[PDB]
Amino acid sequence: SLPDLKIEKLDEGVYVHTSFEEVNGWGVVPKHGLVVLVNAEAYLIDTPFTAKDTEKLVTWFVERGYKIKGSISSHFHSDSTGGIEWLNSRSIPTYASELTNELLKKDGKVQATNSFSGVNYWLVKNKIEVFYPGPGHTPDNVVVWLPERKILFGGCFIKPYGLGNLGDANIEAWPKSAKLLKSKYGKAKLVVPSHSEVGDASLLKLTLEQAVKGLNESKK
Ligand SMILES: O=C(O)[C@@H](Cc1ccc2c(c1)OCO2)[C@H](Cc1ccc2c(c1)OCO2)C(=O)O
Ligand SMILES: [Zn+2]
Ligand SMILES: [Zn+2]
Numbered sequence: 001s002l003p004d005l006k007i008e009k010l011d012e013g014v015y016v017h018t019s020f021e022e023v024n025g026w027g028v029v030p031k032h033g034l035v036v037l038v039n040a041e042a043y044l045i046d047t048p049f050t051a052k053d054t055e056k057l058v059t060w061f062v063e064r065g066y067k068i069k070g071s072i073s074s075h076f077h078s079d080s081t082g083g084i085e086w087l088n089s090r091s092i093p094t095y096a097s098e099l100t101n102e103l104l105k106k107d108g109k110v111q112a113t114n115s116f117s118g119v120n121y122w123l124v125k126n127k128i129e130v131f132y133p134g135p136g137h138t139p140d141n142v143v144v145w146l147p148e149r150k151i152l153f154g155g156c157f158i159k160p161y162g163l164g165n166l167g168d169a170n171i172e173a174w175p176k177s178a179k180l181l182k183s184k185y186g187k188a189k190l191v192v193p194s195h196s197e198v199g200d201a202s203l204l205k206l207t208l209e210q211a212v213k214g215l216n217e218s219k220k
């Protein structure tokens with residue numbers, strides 16, 4: 001028995017969902033993703049860890065009259081894709097990049113029903129932008145921009161106190177990737193990390209500092 005799923009308003013039309021998992025040697029891990037409202041529609045930014053919480057998330061928005069139009073996962077790890085299987089079984093479109101789908105497949109996992117290419121896919125014209133700053137936490141990590149409110153979902157790429165799980169990271173590339181993101185999204189009002197609470201554009205600079213640090217460290 002783990003803590004319950006949390007759903008809270010962050011701004012008009014934007015909610016943070018928080019799920020919790022007991023993984024490895026890190027004890028219980030909070031994971032944040034978003035739900036973005038589009039008139040009568042709701043889009044998921046990352047899924048909870050699990051089918052059961054993913055179903056709880058949808059039921060909470062469906063039962064208020066919001067039909068789930070779709071989901072996008074920011075990278076292949078299960079804290080961003082654990083609910084794709086369930087979603088596909090309820091005929092809710094799911095999205096990921098071609099590379100993210102390749103990594104899922106390689107890993108024996110269910111793929112997103114919909115794929116995209118490019119550094120800048122627009123899931124919802126002028127409302128939900130996906131952008132690829134380069135490798136870091138993983139080769140495929142992408143970020144999700146929300147232009148109406150200027151909120152950036154940074155996923156597991158944003159790490160203001162230390163880089164986290166390095167099993168699939170590219171530490172040699174992370175600083176470069178961090179500087180591009182720091183520039184493209186310098187006018188973010190709020191920045192949303194996967195495993196830290198919500199910050200401002202400062203988190204883009206702390207992450208850059210941590211990546212440079214970690215690389216220095218790697219050299220010994
Ligand atoms: O790599 C990640 O995405 C998580 C590791 C993780 C944890 C739970 C899981 C999982 C993968 O798949 C299914 O359940 C990792 C979480 C983490 C761990 C330690 C940290 C941390 C984040 O930030 C600071 O210290 C990260 O994002 O870096
Ligand atoms: Zn990850
Ligand atoms: Zn993560």
Ligand SMILES: [Zn+2]
Nearest residue numbers: 018030032197
């Ligand atoms: Zn939180």
